[PDB]
Design a protein around this motif. Structure first.
Motif, PDB file in Angstrom:
ATOM      1  N   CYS A  14       0.814  -1.090  -0.018  1.00  0.00           N
ATOM      2  CA  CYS A  14       0.069   0.193  -0.003  1.00  0.00           C
ATOM      3  C   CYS A  14       0.825   1.265  -0.175  1.00  0.00           C
ATOM      4  O   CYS A  14       1.953   1.140   0.869  1.00  0.00           O
ATOM      5  CB  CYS A  14      -0.918   0.191   1.099  1.00  0.00           C
ATOM      6  SG  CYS A  14      -1.989   1.375   1.404  1.00  0.00           S
ATOM      7  N   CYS A  31      -4.676   1.109  -0.722  1.00  0.00           N
ATOM      8  CA  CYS A  31      -5.265  -0.206  -0.504  1.00  0.00           C
ATOM      9  C   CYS A  31      -6.948  -0.076   0.017  1.00  0.00           C
ATOM     10  O   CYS A  31      -7.442   0.934  -0.061  1.00  0.00           O
ATOM     11  CB  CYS A  31      -4.648  -1.136   0.468  1.00  0.00           C
ATOM     12  SG  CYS A  31      -5.024  -0.555   2.334  1.00  0.00           S
ATOM     13  N   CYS A  34      -7.394   2.072   3.202  1.00  0.00           N
ATOM     14  CA  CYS A  34      -7.215   3.360   3.013  1.00  0.00           C
ATOM     15  C   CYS A  34      -8.087   3.733   2.214  1.00  0.00           C
ATOM     16  O   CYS A  34      -8.689   4.872   2.527  1.00  0.00           O
ATOM     17  CB  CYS A  34      -5.690   3.793   2.687  1.00  0.00           C
ATOM     18  SG  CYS A  34      -4.485   2.685   3.849  1.00  0.00           S
TER      19      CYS A  34
HETATM   20 ZN   LIG Z   1      -3.609   0.998   2.874  1.00  0.00          ZN
END
Ligand SMILES: [Zn+2]
Length: 49
Positions: A14, A31, A34
């Protein structure tokens, strides 16, 4: 077995250097975690309104 989504977790970590999770093809550079987490930032209010 009812698995798989638009995005596919690649071998890339990520974006965030603190997120141990990988970034999907539909979540990159962020990702799934997030990505959605950021969405909250912007909101259009209640669907009705
Ligand atoms: Zn993330």
């Amino acid at each position: 077995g009812s698995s798989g989504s638009s995005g596919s977790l690649m071998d890339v970590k990520c974006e965030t250097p603190n997120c141990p999770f990988f970034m999907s093809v539909n979540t990159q550079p962020l990702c799934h975690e997030c990505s959605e987490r950021r969405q909250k930032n912007q909101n259009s209010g209640p669907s009705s309104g």
